Design a protein around this ligand. Structure first.
Ligand SMILES: CCc1cccc(CC)c1-c1ccc(C(=O)O)s1
Length: 254
């Protein structure tokens, strides 16, 4: 088939720098937001044409293996990926999204849909580790790309695959959603170190939907009820209005 053509952003771990990773994340944001409350809001899923529903992230590593992740522009989340002659999809939430993803990678000979969604709860269970024990950085991403690639010929076990999804979703989707998490990956690249995310990152990730709702329903930025977030040391604090989150959250779900 001659599939529908979605925008494609490239990143390689070979020779990766703070700047090249920053350019990558900035490019992903720019193609995701094609509407600003106080912070850009991702396009409404309602009435969004199929030709504008997806973007593609092509990842390459030092071994010159390439995989292509497919991102939903309405929530910045990975719905599936292509490696060579195979395409793999998380289980869709509803019939409409199931139809939308039939338009991705349609020239691939083998299409596979998992029974599990791309959510952290199930991915962590499959990986056998929580996010707080899965290291992130250029090293983990290099390994994630290879693990994703070799799943198509059975060279990757499912826990490794699920761990590699958790790495990719955070270093791409969450970093695009939050300048704070983009900064977290920047720092790992600066020290050439790999480390798991701390509670401030993990709780920010868990709070994206609630933070988005609180901001968009706020009275001139003021929240109706406070949102609890975590500090780096695990202690909690309350967020009462959108202003403190401006340097933190870069994209909001509609
Ligand atoms: C400006 C600080 C801030 C604003 C909005 C949300 C959060 C939570 C991710 C944070 C913090 C980041 C680390 C903090 C700490 O370790 O004290 S607070």
């Amino acid at each position: 088939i001659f599939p529908k053509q979605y925008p494609i952003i490239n990143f390689t771990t070979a020779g990766a720098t703070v700047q090249s990773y920053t350019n990558f994340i900035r490019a992903v944001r720019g193609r995701l937001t094609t509407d600003v409350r106080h912070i850009p809001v991702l396009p409404n899923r309602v009435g969004l044409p199929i030709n504008q529903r997806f973007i593609l992230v092509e990842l390459s590593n030092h071994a010159e293996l390439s995989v292509t992740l497919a991102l939903d522009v309405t929530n910045a989340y990975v719905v599936g990926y292509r490696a060579g002659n195979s395409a793999y999809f998380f289980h869709p939430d509803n019939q409409e999204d199931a139809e939308a993803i039939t338009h991705l990678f349609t020239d691939v000979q083998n299409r596979y849909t998992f029974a599990f969604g791309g959510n952290y709860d199930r991915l962590e269970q499959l990986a056998g580790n929580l996010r707080e024990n899965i290291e992130l950085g250029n090293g983990p991403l290099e390994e994630a790309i290879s693990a994703l690639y070799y799943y198509s010929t059975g060279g990757t076990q499912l826990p490794t695959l699920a761990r590699s999804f958790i790495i990719c979703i955070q270093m791409i989707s969450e970093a695009a959603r939050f300048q704070y998490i983009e900064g977290e990956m920047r720092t790992r690249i600066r020290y050439n170190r790999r480390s798991a995310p701390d509670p401030s990152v993990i709780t920010l990730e868990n709070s994206w939907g609630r933070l988005s709702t609180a901001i968009q329903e706020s009275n001139q930025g003021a929240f109706a009820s406070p949102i609890q977030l975590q500090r780096r040391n695990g202690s909690k604090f309350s967020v009462y209005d959108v202003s403190i989150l401006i340097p933190i959250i870069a994209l909001m779900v509609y």
